[PDB]
């Protein structure tokens, strides 16, 4: 029952201080060879070692970030506290804490947390604009979902009935705002003969809209 769980603010404006908590159980930071490490991974990119704190209060830092980093432990409540000072947008990533097992002859992270997502931007909550994308045996339609913040957005076709031939593309950042498109391929007969609408939700702004695609 070794477990770790990250907690954090979720969203932060630049220049601020990122505070992350790791709550762990199933092992003690009073036992030798034990530590907690922080690792981060920007969406779709590689992993980066930030720092770790050990059972004997030894601390080790990535020199590129060491000036901005602070870590402590509360061994009785099984928690490790991470602070990153002065965040810029490049500090946007998934953050993992994990148990470090370390000896004079081995090292590894054998149990990780699920991770917590951290977004650094000046942007404010902003609903999306939904625009219809209209033009063989098949026709492709689309839905442009533009200018929202923050992630995520759900896109569905005909409330779910259309599942095959649906692609929804990863969001992309444009002036502190996300834009994403969804694509649907149906036979040229069902459309415009029958109704094709995309259904778009943006829960952070309580946005729920349906947009029919007229020819």
């Amino acid at each position: 029952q070794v477990t770790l769980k990250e907690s954090g603010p979720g969203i932060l404006q630049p220049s601020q201080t990122l505070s992350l908590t790791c709550s762990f159980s199933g092992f003690s930071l009073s036992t030798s060879n034990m530590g907690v490490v922080w690792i981060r991974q920007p969406s779709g990119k590689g992993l980066e070692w930030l720092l770790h704190i050990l059972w004997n209060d030894g601390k080790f830092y990535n020199p590129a970030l060491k000036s901005r980093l602070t870590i402590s432990k509360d061994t009785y409540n099984n928690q490790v506290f991470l602070k990153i000072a002065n965040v810029d947008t490049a500090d946007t990533a998934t953050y993992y804490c994990a148990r470090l097992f370390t000896t004079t002859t081995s090292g590894y992270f054998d149990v990780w947390g699920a991770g917590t997502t951290v977004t650094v931007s000046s942007a404010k909550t902003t609903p999306p604009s939904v625009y219809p994308l209209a033009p063989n045996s098949m026709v492709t339609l689309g839905c442009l979902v533009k200018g929202y913040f923050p992630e995520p957005v759900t896109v569905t076709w005909n409330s779910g009935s259309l599942s095959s031939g649906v692609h929804t593309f990863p969001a992309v950042l444009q002036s502190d705002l996300y834009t994403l498109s969804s694509s649907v391929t149906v036979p040229s007969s069902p459309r415009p003969s029958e109704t094709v609408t995309c259904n778009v939700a943006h829960p952070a702004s309580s946005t729920k809209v349906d947009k029919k695609i007229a020819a």
């Binding site: 992993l47 993992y96 002859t105 081995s106 090292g107 590894y108 992270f109 054998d110 699920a114």
Partner: peptide, 8 residues
């Protein structure tokens, strides 16, 4: 989240 496959 990544899982450990191999060490040393």
């Amino acid at each position: 989240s990544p899982q450990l496959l191999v060490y040393n």
